[PDB]
Amino acid sequence: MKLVRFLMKLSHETVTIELKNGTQVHGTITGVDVSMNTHLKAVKMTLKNREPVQLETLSIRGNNIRYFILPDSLPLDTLLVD
Amino acid sequence: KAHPPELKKFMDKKLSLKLNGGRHVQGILRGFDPFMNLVIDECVEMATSGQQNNIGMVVIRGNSIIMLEALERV
Amino acid sequence: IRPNHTIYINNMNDKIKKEELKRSLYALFSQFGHVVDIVALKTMKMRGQAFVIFKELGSSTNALRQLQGFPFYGKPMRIQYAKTDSDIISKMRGPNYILFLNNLPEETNEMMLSMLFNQFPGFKEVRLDIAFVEFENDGQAGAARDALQGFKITPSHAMKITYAKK
């Protein structure tokens, strides 16, 4: 029903987030709030026509995230049960 | 919540409003609204060449309101 | 004029930018001490003048004495003491051991003598046209005797500081 409870239970997983400006940040999801505030640690960000930069921490808002990319070994069938 | 904007001092005063896309209008305000909607009676809009065109009483919504400058001392 | 932490320089070139002149004044004042603030305006009232407020009053006095009449961007700037206290300094604020003083003004209170002796570090006590100032340190008392020998305080008379005898 609510996607925020499913996104909050995806902690300690290496995922990727593509923004609306073409910047893709790949990192381990460590913190998710009700407003989809993605706080990741040891992330790598690649902007549009720029070099990738590695950061120890990153905080991306929910309104600035356009798409997400999860690994194929993620238990989406078990995490969907509330 | 839902507090109205402080537009009591700018009532019945000739002010110039800016709208999105680079639009400029000038007119006297005739009321207020909690959704930042302004009614400008006998409004005149500035064209691209510089000529002013009188459009009469118009209604400007708050979604495209950029800046309103009062041309009269309040 | 009493010495303070803020030194005001005037008669400078007003044709340069404000930020470039402020950076040049900061680079000039960094050689004498830590510059806490730099007030520089370019209006019609404050044209061609600026000021630097430092942490210590001795560094500001050394910058006012050393850079007196120094050429700055083609024009020799004149440095002097500030008339009032700075706002940042007011916000942040709120041989022998005994030295003999002669020809002291009688109208000066103990607070003015404490503010004059505050250039040296903390002393033991003060005694009040003759006065006796005893410091807790020997080197601080020697520096206070070498600094107050002919100081510029109450310029109608001349103050003389000498070391006490046994």
Binding site: - | - | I16, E19, E20, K22, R23, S24, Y26, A27, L28, S30, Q31, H34, V35, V36, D37, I38, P71, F72, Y73, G74
Partner: protein
């Protein structure tokens, strides 16, 4: 009292008068400037006044370093790898140093981003045609010893020793 990581981590850092992040490292008497990797290029200005540094070298790669205060020191030689470690170095205050010859200003020509240089109160400034040699060797510098470089001084520097 050498410059280490514990001395840089315990040093005060704040905003200067030009709204830049400056760390106050004065009053340390460091004989050699080293171990600057603990700052991680988080400071825009370096306040190393009143020290005992002999050579301005040994600095790591810091792209955010734009101002260097080396006043009241004994700097007599400049490192040749200053451009590879500070590409954005624009302010260099070397007043009251131990520079005696103009040949120490030859590694200073590699800093293309340097615009403000101070070489006052030095025996190298008392030599003949020192300002013309500094203008000819470093054309990127616009302000030398709190003086704006004019076109006549550039023409006099380009005429002699061409």
């Amino acid at each position: 009292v050498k410059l280490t990581a514990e001395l840089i981590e315990q040093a005060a850092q704040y905003t200067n008068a030009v709204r830049d992040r400056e760390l106050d490292l004065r009053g340390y008497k460091i004989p050699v400037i080293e171990n600057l990797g603990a700052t991680l290029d988080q400071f825009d200005a370096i306040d190393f006044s009143d020290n005992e540094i002999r050579k301005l070298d040994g600095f790591p790669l810091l792209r955010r370093l734009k101002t260097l205060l080396v006043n009241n020191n004994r700097i007599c030689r400049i490192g040749e790898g200053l451009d590879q470690a500070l590409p954005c170095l624009t302010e260099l205050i070397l007043t009251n140093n131990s520079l005696v010859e103009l040949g120490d200003l030859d590694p200073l020509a590699s800093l293309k981003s340097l615009t403000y240089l101070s070489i006052l109160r030095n025996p190298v400034t008392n030599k003949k045609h020192y300002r013309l040699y500094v203008i000819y060797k470093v054309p990127q510098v616009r302000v030398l010893d709190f003086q704006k470089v004019k076109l006549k001084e550039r023409q006099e520097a380009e005429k002699m020793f061409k």
